[PDB]
Amino acid sequence: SEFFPVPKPIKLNPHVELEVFQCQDTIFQLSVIAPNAKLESHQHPESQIGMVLSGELELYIKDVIKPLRALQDIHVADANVSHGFVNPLSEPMIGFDLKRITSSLPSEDVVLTLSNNQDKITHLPCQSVKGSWFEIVMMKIPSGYSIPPHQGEQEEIGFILNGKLEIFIENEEQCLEYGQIYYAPSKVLKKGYNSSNQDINLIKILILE
Ligand SMILES: [Fe+2]
């Protein structure tokens, strides 16, 4: 559905498997890169951001190499900037990226790092960073916690890394698990509830937009 998009699996090559979700003007994908493998350098008109969820990656961008740490660093490739990746480990790299045509001034950075902050809506501790067209927020949703109803100007894509989280977007409800995402268009009502016995790690991307 629009709010709970069904992904399309793509076997890109024998070392790269994708799950591709469309969220209106944004394409979101979960990627799995095989041990010691590569995603060869390319360019495209869409701006791109992403993070490693498990494993490690080396970002080849412009004239440099930047290491990307799981759940910490975000790569930032502006429109038509050449970028590629190498998996330096003997373990798979599981990550995500978002692609969108943006009309923003260039980013000062090709890599960003999440830092400690406090989430506006929940007042819970989070790790976040703001870039030129996006903000990424990672936060723990404690067992039993209800994310209160909220509606924003910004589009939001989110997903969880573990457990099961109830998410309501407008009139639709779904119990989300890793491998699924939610998408809340501008001005749509979102709310959620962790009815599980575990703390759930949630990642959201706010599109600025
Ligand atoms: Fe790309």
Final residue belonging to a domain, choices 55, 81, 113: 113
How many of the other CB atoms lie within 10 Å of CB of 187?
11
* Cα atoms in the Cβ-side hemisphere of radius 13 Å centred on 96: 25
Range of the domain at 168: 1-6+114-209
Contact criterion met (CB below 8 Å) for 77 and 131: no
Q: β-strands 182-184, 155-160: how paired?
A: antiparallel
**Considering 113, 132, 165, which residue would you say is the last residue of a domain?**
113
Same domain for 180 and 97, yes or no, is: no
Compute the residue count for the chain.
209
Q: Tell me the Cα Rg of the chain.
A: 16
- Going from the Cα of 45 to the center of ligand 1, the distance in angstroms, rounded, reads 9
Structure method: X-ray
Distance 146 CA to ligand 1 centre (A): 36
| Cβ within 8 Å of residue 147, ≥6 positions away | 121, 122, 141, 190, 191, 192, 193
Do 122 and 186 share a structural domain?
yes
Q: In total, how many domains does the chain have?
A: 2
- Ligand 1 center to 77 CA (angstroms): 8
* Residue that terminates a domain, selected from 113, 139, 161: 113
Task: Indicate if 121 and 205 belong to the same structural domain.
Answer: yes
43-56 burial: b if 16+ Cβ within 10 Å, else e = eeebbbbbbbbebb
CA atoms lying within 13 Å on the CB side of residue 170: 11
- 166 alpha carbon to ligand 1 midpoint, in Å? 31
What backbone torsions phi and psi does residue 64 show, to the nearest 5 degrees?
Answer: -135, 170
- 111 Cα to the center of ligand 1, angstroms: 14
Same domain as 152, residue 142: yes
Question: Rounded to the nearest whole angstrom, what is the distance from the C-alpha of residue 48 to the centroid of ligand 1?
Answer: 6
63 Cβ contact list (under 8 Å, min separation 6): none
